[PDB]
Amino acid sequence: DPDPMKNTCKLLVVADHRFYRYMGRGEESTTTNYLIELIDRVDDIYRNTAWDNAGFKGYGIQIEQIRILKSPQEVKPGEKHYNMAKSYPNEEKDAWDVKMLLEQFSFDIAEEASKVCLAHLFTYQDFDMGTLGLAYVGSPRANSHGGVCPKAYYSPVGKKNIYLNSGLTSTKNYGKTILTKEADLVTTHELGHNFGAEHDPDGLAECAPNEDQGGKYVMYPIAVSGDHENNKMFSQCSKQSIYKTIESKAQECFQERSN
Ligand SMILES: CC#CCOc1ccc(S(=O)(=O)N2CCSC(C)(C)[C@@H]2C(=O)NO)cc1
Numbered sequence: 001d002p003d004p005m006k007n008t009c010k011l012l013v014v015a016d017h018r019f020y021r022y023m024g025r026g027e028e029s030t031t032t033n034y035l036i037e038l039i040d041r042v043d044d045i046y047r048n049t050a051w052d053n054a055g056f057k058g059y060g061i062q063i064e065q066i067r068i069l070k071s072p073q074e075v076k077p078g079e080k081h082y083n084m085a086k087s088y089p090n091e092e093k094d095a096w097d098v099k100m101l102l103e104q105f106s107f108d109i110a111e112e113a114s115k116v117c118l119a120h121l122f123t124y125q126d127f128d129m130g131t132l133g134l135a136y137v138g139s140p141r142a143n144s145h146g147g148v149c150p151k152a153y154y155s156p157v158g159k160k161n162i163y164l165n166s167g168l169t170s171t172k173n174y175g176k177t178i179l180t181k182e183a184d185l186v187t188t189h190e191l192g193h194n195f196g197a198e199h200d201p202d203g204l205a206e207c208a209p210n211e212d213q214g215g216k217y218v219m220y221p222i223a224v225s226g227d228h229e230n231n232k233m234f235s236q237c238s239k240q241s242i243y244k245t246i247e248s249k250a251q252e253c254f255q256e257r258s259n
C-alpha cells in the first residue's frame with residue numbers, strides 16, 4: 001500500500017533562455033506559471049494512474065525548485081553549456097543533437113540534480129526528425145544509473161559525479177509551437193521513461209490499440225495526437241515496468257505530497 005510520506009517525485013524544472021523567450025514571452029512569472037500548470041496537468045495523469053490496476057495509486061510529481069534562465073550562458077572558444085546561446089555540435093542548426101543536449105544538461109545540473117528525484121529541462125529547439133523529447137530510463141535496480149532517484153557516477157573526463165535522473169522536453173516542432181495538450185504528453189512520456197517505461201510494443205494489441213478501442217498509449221514510439229482516449233494514459237506494458245520501479249525507488253527518493 002502506498003506510503004503517504006513517500007508518494008511524490010519532486011522536480012527540478014529548468015527553463016533555459018529559449019523557452020523563457022519564446023514560450024514565456026520574456027516574462028519570468030509567465031514562464032513559471034506555464035510550467036507550474038504543465039507539471040500540474042502531468043501530475044493529474046500520474047496521480048490518477050493505478051500501476052497495479054487496483055490501489056497502487058496516488059503517485060505523482062511536484063516541483064521542488066523552478067529555475068528560469070532569463071539569459072544564455074556565455075561561452076568562449078572550445079567550451080560548451082546546455083543553456084549557452086549557440087547550439088552544439090552544429091552552429092548552423094536551430095537545435096542541438098538531442099542526445100548531446102541531455103548529456104550536457106545532466107553534467108551542468110549535476111550539483112542541483114543530486115538533491116532531487118528528477119531534473120527536467122524545458123527548451124524551445126527544433127530537433128531533427130520530429131524529435132520532441134528525451135530522457136533516461138529508470139529501473140528498480142539500486143545501481144541503475146538513469147531515471148528516478150539520484151545515483152552518482154564519477155565522470156573521469158567531467159572531473160566530477162553525475163546523475164542521470166533527467167530528461168527534457170521541447171515545445172517547438174516543424175518550425176512551430178506544439179499544442180499545449182501535445183506538450184503535456186511529451187513531458188508525461190519522458191517522465192514515463194524516467195519512471196521506468198520503455199516504448200510500447202507497437203504490434204501488441206493490448207498495449208497499442210486501434211483508434212476504435214481508444215488509440216495508442218502515451219509510451220507509443222511515434223508522437224500521439226492527444227485526440228484519443230488512451231493517448232493520456234499508461235498501457236499495461238508501461239504499468240508493469242513503472243510499478244516495479246516505484247515499488248523499489250519510492251522508499252529511496254520519493255517525498256510527501258505538498259499542498
Ligand atoms: C505529442 C506526444 C507525445 C508522447 O511523447 C513523446 C515524446 C517524444 C517522442 S519523439 O521525440 O518523437 N521520439 C520517438 C522515437 S525514439 C526518440 C528517442 C527519437 C524519441 C523518444 O521516444 N523520446 O523519448 C514521441 C512521443
Ligand SMILES: [Zn+2]
Nearest residue numbers: 189190193199
Ligand atoms: Zn520515448
